[PDB]
Amino acid sequence: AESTLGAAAAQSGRYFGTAIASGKLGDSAYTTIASREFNMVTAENEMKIDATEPQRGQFNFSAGDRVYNWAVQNGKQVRGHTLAWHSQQPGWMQSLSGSTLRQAMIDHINGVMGHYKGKIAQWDVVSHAFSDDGSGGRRDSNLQRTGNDWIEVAFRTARAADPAAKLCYNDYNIENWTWAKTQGVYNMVRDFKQRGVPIDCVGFQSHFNSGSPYNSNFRTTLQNFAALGVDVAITELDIQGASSSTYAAVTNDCLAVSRCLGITVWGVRDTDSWRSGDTPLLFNGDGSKKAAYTAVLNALNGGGQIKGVGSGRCLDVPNASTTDGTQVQLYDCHSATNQQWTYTDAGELRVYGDKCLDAAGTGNGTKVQIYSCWGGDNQKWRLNSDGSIVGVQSGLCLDAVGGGTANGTLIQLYSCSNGSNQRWTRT
Ligand SMILES: O[C@@H]1[C@@H](O)[C@H](O[C@@H]2CO[C@@H](O[C@@H]3CO[C@@H](O[C@@H]4CO[C@@H](O[C@@H]5CO[C@@H](O)[C@H](O)[C@H]5O)[C@H](O)[C@H]4O)[C@H](O)[C@H]3O)[C@H](O)[C@H]2O)OC[C@H]1O
Ligand SMILES: O[C@@H]1[C@@H](O)[C@H](O[C@@H]2CO[C@@H](O[C@@H]3CO[C@@H](O[C@@H]4CO[C@@H](O)[C@H](O)[C@H]4O)[C@H](O)[C@H]3O)[C@H](O)[C@H]2O)OC[C@H]1O
Numbered sequence: 001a002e003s004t005l006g007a008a009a010a011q012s013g014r015y016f017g018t019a020i021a022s023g024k025l026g027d028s029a030y031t032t033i034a035s036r037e038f039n040m041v042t043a044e045n046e047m048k049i050d051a052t053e054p055q056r057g058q059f060n061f062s063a064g065d066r067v068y069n070w071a072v073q074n075g076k077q078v079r080g081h082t083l084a085w086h087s088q089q090p091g092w093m094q095s096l097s098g099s100t101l102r103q104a105m106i107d108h109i110n111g112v113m114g115h116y117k118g119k120i121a122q123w124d125v126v127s128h129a130f131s132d133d134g135s136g137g138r139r140d141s142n143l144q145r146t147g148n149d150w151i152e153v154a155f156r157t158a159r160a161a162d163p164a165a166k167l168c169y170n171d172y173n174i175e176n177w178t179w180a181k182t183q184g185v186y187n188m189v190r191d192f193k194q195r196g197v198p199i200d201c202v203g204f205q206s207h208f209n210s211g212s213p214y215n216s217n218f219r220t221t222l223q224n225f226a227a228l229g230v231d232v233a234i235t236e237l238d239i240q241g242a243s244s245s246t247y248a249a250v251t252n253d254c255l256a257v258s259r260c261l262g263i264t265v266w267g268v269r270d271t272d273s274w275r276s277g278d279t280p281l282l283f284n285g286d287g288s289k290k291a292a293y294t295a296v297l298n299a300l301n302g303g304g305q306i307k308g309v310g311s312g313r314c315l316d317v318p319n320a321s322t323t324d325g326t327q328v329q330l331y332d333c334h335s336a337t338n339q340q341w342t343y344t345d346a347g348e349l350r351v352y353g354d355k356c357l358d359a360a361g362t363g364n365g366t367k368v369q370i371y372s373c374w375g376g377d378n379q380k381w382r383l384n385s386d387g388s389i390v391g392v393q394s395g396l397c398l399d400a401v402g403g404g405t406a407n408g409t410l411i412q413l414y415s416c417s418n419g420s421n422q423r424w425t426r427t
């Protein structure tokens with residue numbers, strides 16, 4: 001299949017997952033999208049230390065099992081997140097140190113992995129162990145103070161607890177190869193593989209924003225780790241602004257690495273995001289697919305003027321007008337600014353530089369025109385591989401009225417039909 005992210009990824013033996021929040025599983029809109037699009041699930045918080053072991057020796061898997069069962073019942077594998085790390089520790093663990101903390105760490109791993117033995121595809125055994133100070137060294141935490149060998153111990157413990165689970169080291173800001181942090185993790189994993197430490201994968205959270213931007217060398221990082229003999233996975237992907245090109249780029253990086261198991265985005269809709277203000281996911285709050293969604297889908301499926309297939313004519317702004325409200329038409333193709341459209345990372349189709357293909361409504365027959373660019377979803381479009389152009393807000397296709405092919409045929413929104421008057425080719 002190839003109409004959903006999970007199915008499209010499966011074509012190359014990969015998966016496309018999301019982070020599921022137990023509190024949202026009772027949401028029809030949420031579950032409809034989640035069950036349909038993803039085939040891998042990570043509990044957003046339900047399998048962390050404080051959630052699974054509120055009291056030392058007292059385990060609670062109610063919430064974790066709810067997400068797990070929903071995942072398997074709906075055809076998704078599960079990534080366990082996370083067994084040992086400095087964040088979100090229950091109060092009792094936060095105050096522990098030395099040998100007692102080391103024992104608690106081990107006990108926690110055995111308890112949680114034991115409960116889910118043989119049912120977890122990947123476990124983020126250790127997370128966030130390195131610092132952001134630029135030294136490339138370990139971050140100072142109670143776990144690190146128990147001995148630099150805590151990570152190695154965590155992994156050896158995990159292997160014995162559940163030999164069937166792939167064991168991953170997970171962290172953020174380790175995507176750009178030139179960063180010290182990235183190098184620190186690389187050296188650690190290289191050391192582990194050389195000494196036989198049981199580690200099967202490295203998880204790259206991939207939280208990209210202007211503070212820690214995506215860089216094409218992320219592919220190099222993935223390939224360098226893959227060369228060590230470990231699988232790699234994009235575990236908590238979200239991109240500030242949800243740039244279509246960046247989302248497609250990350251997707252293609254995984255597809256370019258045979259050892260990249262799959263990609264998980266950190267959430268379903270922008271409104272479900274831990275950083276909703278960065279509108280970093282693939283679905284809008286109203287549940288509509290964003291421009292980035294189609295960019296990712298096209299990439300998973302194999303991956304100027306806009307000319308209509310059925311008419312052989314180009315999307316044209318009448319008399320090269322720059323007046324807001326001017327409805328677009330079909331017209332003989334020629335070199336003119338009123339026929340030069342630029343698709344942006346935000347999903348707009350710009351003309352004249354600051355004018356945007358705009359839909360003045362959401363129903364059939366809605367006039368497609370130009371209007372000042374401002375970022376509305378009625379100015380954002382999805383470029384399908386089949387040649388159709390779908391409005392984000394409306395979910396409707398650009399359509400040449402009445403199947404018209406002559407000069408002057410107007411453009412409207414209309415239920416997608418795969419008709420030639422709804423298919424376009426970029427020149
Ligand atoms: O419901 C919530 C859960 O969703 C949430 O999940 C955790 C989210 O992801 C992981 O934790 C976060 C990872 O990203 C960190 O922020 C980085 C910090 O560094 C920034 O870049 C810096 C820019 O300036 C430079 O000088 C510096 O060197 C750079 O590091 C980067 O842009 C940010 O994205 C967050 O602090 C982490 O919390 C974790 O795996 C998930 O479990 O957990 C909370 C829950 O409520
Ligand atoms: O995917 C399937 C759908 O395609 C199918 O319904 C199709 C919907 O599009 C139909 O063609 C439309 C008909 O309307 C034309 O525009 C109107 C022309 O007259 C004007 O007065 C009016 O204002 C315009 O809106 C549009 O250009 C043309 O593409 C097609 O015939 C239907 O079959 O339904 C089943 C779906 O699975």
Ligand SMILES: O[C@@H]1[C@@H](O)[C@H](O[C@@H]2CO[C@@H](O)[C@H](O)[C@H]2O)OC[C@H]1O
Nearest residue numbers: 316317318319320331334336338408
């Ligand atoms: O007379 C006007 C037409 O000129 C206009 O369409 C233009 C035709 O010439 C082409 O070179 C232009 O690109 C195209 O916009 O449509 C409206 C009509 O009244």
